[PDB]
Design an enzyme around this catalytic site. Structure first.
Site, PDB file in Angstrom:
ATOM      1  N   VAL A 179      79.867   1.466 -46.545  1.00 14.86           N
ATOM      2  CA  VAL A 179      80.991   0.823 -47.287  1.00 14.86           C
ATOM      3  C   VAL A 179      81.812  -0.082 -46.366  1.00 14.86           C
ATOM      4  O   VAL A 179      81.997   0.199 -45.197  1.00 14.86           O
ATOM      5  CB  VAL A 179      81.899   1.899 -47.896  1.00 14.86           C
ATOM      6  N   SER A 180      82.314  -1.162 -46.906  1.00 20.30           N
ATOM      7  CA  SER A 180      83.143  -2.102 -46.102  1.00 20.30           C
ATOM      8  C   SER A 180      84.532  -2.210 -46.739  1.00 20.30           C
ATOM      9  O   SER A 180      85.536  -2.266 -46.055  1.00 20.30           O
ATOM     10  CB  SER A 180      82.481  -3.479 -46.082  1.00 20.30           C
ATOM     11  N   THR A 181      84.592  -2.239 -48.050  1.00 17.00           N
ATOM     12  CA  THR A 181      85.910  -2.340 -48.744  1.00 17.00           C
ATOM     13  C   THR A 181      86.513  -0.940 -48.899  1.00 17.00           C
ATOM     14  O   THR A 181      85.868   0.054 -48.625  1.00 17.00           O
ATOM     15  CB  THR A 181      85.725  -2.989 -50.124  1.00 17.00           C
TER      16      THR A 181
END
Length: 105
Positions: free
Chosen positions: A9-11
């Protein structure tokens, strides 16, 4: 042979859910979703960490392109050389096949 999918995940909203749907859309089983909740105190590189010991001989590792495998060091190529030697393949949603061209030519 199985359809393993690596995710990260990045957000900070629900990238893990969006990522899983990305791996499944790619052709990955939900039961085999080694995602990485990077949205924490630090990077949670546990997906490939366990994937290196969970992939079977002749398994396909579908990787999605949401941010980037590594960053500076040869991280993206590290787990690729590790799986390439384990007789495992790694599909890439960016093209459909694995890194058919990663040598020091």
């Amino acid at each position: 042979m199985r359809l393993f999918g690596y995710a990260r995940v990045s957000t900070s909203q629900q990238s893990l859910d969006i990522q899983v749907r990305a791996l499944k859309d790619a052709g990955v089983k939900a039961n085999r979703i080694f995602t990485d909740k990077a949205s924490g105190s630090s990077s949670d590189r546990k997906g490939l960490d366990l994937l290196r010991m969970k992939v079977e001989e002749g398994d396909v590792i579908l990787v999605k392109k949401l941010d980037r495998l590594g960053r500076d060091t040869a991280d993206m190529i590290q787990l690729i050389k590790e799986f390439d030697a384990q007789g495992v393949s790694i599909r890439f949603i960016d093209d459909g096949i694995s890194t058919d061209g990663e040598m020091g030519k």
